[PDB]
């Protein structure tokens, strides 16, 4: 239930 | 192809056992982990795992466990570990399980020699070590040898000193006895902020060279990126906090680093492969994201565990109190007792 986008275990922003 | 994908996540102290679906993502193995061991900061943390090639690799989050090359045996072996590193420890490790798995993958890095430790600060260390374990040195009870059973020094310490275990416990004893009255959970916040200062503490190196092919070796940390000369890993050549980069780049074995000064020239190193060039931008990222965030309000969460640890402590404070004066009463009726 693939849909974290993020590497480690907080969200990058941009 | 196998039938199960069992899975072992060791922490610093528990070893936990999970199987797993063909399609979970990091994420999800990740969140079992934590919800597991009641981890809540987890902002911090990682599984590190070893590819098919041997070398030590996080498990991507955003992606399928089995996509991600990690050496196919039963069960996939990840140590759960703090990857990122506060700017403070006192400030930022709200909750003492957050405090506890700290102290105890730093104090593995001191007692391995991979973090530096001068000897005077290794007996210290070892001393806040010493009163969490055993609590207050008590005569009665700690007699010569009490931590004979005990890795307490850095083996570079111990080789490079003269004195045989029964001197080094007595150096370390001297300390123990000054804690007294010490909760331990305070001992372990008071053994991280000295090893917080400690040069070495919470750098990754990864080996580089300049353009004339000169070894050097590059430090990223929560604050920015550094240069370091071959063999001196402790003080920076040239530091790039965050303030001062404008750009990091990669491009194949070529990695950019673009300063906001417009005098000061590009600094310019060469990895031995493209994927050396990816850990350490995506080291990079990960470290500013954490660093703009901790300059940001907290969160609605983190509020919360600020005053649940508030509370928890104020209470705690308040039944010592309580418990010493009742001691206090007890001792005052068993001598006014006896008249
Ligand atoms: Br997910
Ligand atoms: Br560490
Ligand atoms: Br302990
Ligand atoms: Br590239
Ligand atoms: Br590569
Ligand atoms: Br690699
Ligand atoms: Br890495």
């Not at chain 2, 955003?62 to 069960?75: H, L």
């Given at each position: 239930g693939g849909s974290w986008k993020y590497p480690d275990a907080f969200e990058l922003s941009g | 192809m196998p039938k199960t994908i069992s899975v072992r996540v060791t922490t610093m102290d528990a070893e936990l056992e999970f199987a797993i679906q063909p399609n979970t993502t990091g994420k999800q193995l990740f969140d079992q982990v934590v919800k597991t061991i009641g981890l809540?900061?987890?902002?911090?943390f990682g599984l590190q795992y070893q590819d098919t090639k041997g070398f030590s690799t996080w498990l991507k989050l955003?992606?399928?466990?089995?996509?991600?090359?990690?050496?196919?045996?039963?069960?996939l072996l990840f140590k759960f570990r703090a990857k990122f590193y506060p700017e403070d420890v006192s400030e930022e490790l709200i909750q003492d399980i957050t405090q506890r798995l700290f102290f105890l993958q730093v104090k593995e890095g001191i007692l391995n020699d991979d973090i530096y430790c001068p000897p005077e600060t290794a007996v210290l260390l070892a001393s806040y070590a010493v009163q969490s374990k055993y609590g207050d040195f008590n005569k009665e009870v700690h007699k010569?040898?009490?931590?004979?059973?005990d890795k307490l020094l850095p083996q570079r310490v111990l080789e490079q000193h003269k004195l045989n275990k029964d001197q080094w416990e007595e150096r370390i004893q001297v300390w123990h006895e000054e804690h007294?009255?010490?909760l331990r959970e305070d001992a372990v916040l008071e053994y991280l902020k000295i090893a917080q200062?400690?040069?070495?503490?919470?750098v990754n190196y990864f080996s580089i060279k300049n353009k004339k092919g000169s070894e050097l070796w590059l430090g990223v940390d929560a604050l920015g990126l550094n240069i370091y000369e071959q063999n001196d890993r402790?003080?920076?050549k040239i530091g790039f906090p965050w303030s001062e980069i404008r750009n990091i780049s990669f491009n194949d074995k070529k990695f950019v680093i673009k300063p906001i000064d417009k005098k000061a020239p590009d600094f310019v190193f060469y990895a031995p492969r493209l994927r050396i060039n990816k850990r350490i931008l995506a080291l990079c990222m990960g470290n500013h994201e954490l660093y703009m965030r901790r300059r940001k309000p907290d969160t609605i969460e983190v509020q919360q565990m600020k005053a649940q640890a508030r509370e928890e402590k104020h209470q705690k404070q308040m039944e010592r109190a309580m418990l010493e004066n009742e001691k206090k009463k007890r001792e005052m009726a068993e001598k006014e007792k006896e008249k």
């Open positions: - | 809540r900061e987890v902002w911090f955003n992606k399928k466990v089995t996509a991600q090359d990690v050496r196919k045996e039963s069960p010569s040898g009490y931590l004979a059973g007294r009255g010490m200062d400690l040069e070495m503490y919470g402790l003080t920076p």
